[PDB]
Structure 1
Amino acid sequence: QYVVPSAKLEAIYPRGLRVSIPDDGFSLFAFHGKLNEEMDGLEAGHWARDITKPKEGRWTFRDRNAKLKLGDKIYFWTYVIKDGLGYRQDNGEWTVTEFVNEDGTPADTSLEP
């Protein structure tokens, strides 16, 4: 039995959120995440989207409608489906103190406007 991948998030500028998970030939990648609020189960949180088709050996959950702010913390749990064999990466966490570039890399060099 395999294990659930790792959801790598990033703060998009000026308003967005991109996530990624090392796919393993799955079929469904459900993402549940709340902003500034932990979780102890399966709460709707915020980012609640179920993907069925990866991107390229890795799923991508982009959200250009997430009004995030520096300092804020992330809390979520991801769920994959490898043909009736799902696994989730709960108790996950991420930061908002940094933002990445549309290029795909961190665009935070200690320069707060």
Structure 2
Amino acid sequence: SYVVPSAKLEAIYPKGLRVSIPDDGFSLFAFHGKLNEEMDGLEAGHWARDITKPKEGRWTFRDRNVKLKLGDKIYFWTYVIKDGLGYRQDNGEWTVTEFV
């Protein structure tokens, strides 16, 4: 019913991944994703992590170590708890087009 804010993904140079969303009175944010490999629905994913506090208005997940390449695909879903209830951005797809 409620629509989760779309995730913003960023390929960091020379290495790393950041994934974040603005907060909307949430109590948790989780990111589930794979590298160049499609998700079979709500599988856990290669990256699979609960984030438990926001900072500067955003919920941020990072992998400080992945070396991403132009053209890399990330398939994902996110999960958010708002007022004790869960919501998902489903069927996420992102292509690395630039580094930040």
TM-score normalised over the length of structure 2 = 0.89
- For the pair shown, the structure with the greater C-alpha radius of gyration is 1
Shift of 1:95: 1.4
Match of 1:26 in 2: 26
* Greater relative CO, 1 or 2 (CA 8 Å, sep 6+): 2
Sequence identity (%) = 97
CA–CA distance in 2 between the matches of 1:99 and 1:22?
21
Match of 1:47 in 2: 47
Shift of 1:52: 1.2
1:75 aligns to what SS in structure 2?
strand
Deviations 1:2-57 (A, max 9, x none): 22111100100111011111211111101001110112312232221101101122
Which region of structure 1 is more displaced relative to structure 2, 68-77 or 41-50?
41-50
Which region of structure 1 is more displaced relative to structure 2, 37-46 or 76-85?
37-46
Give the RMSD, CA atoms, in angstroms: 1.4
Unaligned runs of 5+ in 1: 101-113
2:26 aligns to what SS in structure 1?
coil
CA–CA distance in 1 between the matches of 2:58 and 2:24?
8
TM-score normalised over the length of structure 1 = 0.80
- Residues 6 and 89 in structure 1, CA contact (< 8 A), matched pair in contact too: yes
Unaligned runs of 5+ in 2: none
- Residues 26 and 81 in structure 1, CA contact (< 8 A), matched pair in contact too: yes
- Residues 29 and 50 in structure 1, CA contact (< 8 A), matched pair in contact too: yes
Match of 2:95 in 1: 95
CA–CA distance in 2 between the matches of 1:35 and 1:23?
26
Deviations 1:67-94 (A, max 9, x none): 2222111110000011321101010111
Residue correspondences, number: 100
Match of 2:79 in 1: 79
